[PDB]
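User: My advisor asked me to double-check a structure prediction for Hepatoma-derived growth factor-related protein 2 before group meeting. I don't want to rely on an old file, so could you generate it fresh from this sequence?
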Amino acid sequence: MPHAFKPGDLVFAKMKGYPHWPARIDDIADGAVKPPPNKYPIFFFGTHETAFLGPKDLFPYDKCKDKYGKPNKRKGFNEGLWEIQNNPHASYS
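Assistant: Sure, here is a fresh prediction for Hepatoma-derived growth factor-related protein 2 from the sequence you gave:
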């Protein structure tokens, strides 16, 4: 039965104007800016951008990869597909 989201969880994250995108729940570094209430720091694979999103925009990667994990023309998407499959927990600094 499902738990709350936690850092390291792999998702597809949906933003207005973008296809469901490979992403992870990031940690927050000591001294780093924290998200708003009920939001999580979402690191988008490929673009390496962070947004703060709530669960309504977060889909589990494993369950949804058949639907959402196909190549896309959007910039950074296919790089992101590689990252989430092959080294999703790496440092992308």
